[PDB]
Amino acid sequence: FEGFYKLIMRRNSVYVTFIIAGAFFGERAVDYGVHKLWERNNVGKRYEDISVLGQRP
Amino acid sequence: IDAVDASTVKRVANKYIYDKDIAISAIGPIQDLPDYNKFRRRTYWNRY
């Protein structure tokens, strides 16, 4: 808690790492959340939802 | 006074100076004097 907190506002090197980590985790969480809502809104329309998927003849 | 060593000065400076608000009082020809924001940025070093 206080250990990381005092390092972030005191050293710019730590703060820069905090920005990089936030960009990494923040973008991944948004990408995951957007995909979950995309899957929910498109039930049954996916490529793997095809009933005859695997029997061409 | 003898108890104030180099580490003591740095600790006190971090308590009172580092990234701290300042008060400015200027008079005369002071158009070239930097603004509050410039003085406020110069209270910390981003290279550390």
Partner: peptide, 28 residues
């Protein structure tokens, strides 16, 4: 102030490399 800063900036550089290049799977 010199060794600690060098360690801190090296850590940020390593974090940036893992963030730009994602070597997930290369960690074997």
């Amino acid at each position: 102030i010199d060794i600690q800063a060098a360690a801190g900036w090296g850590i940020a550089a390593a974090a940036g490399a893992i963030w730009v290049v994602q070597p997930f799977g290369w960690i074997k």
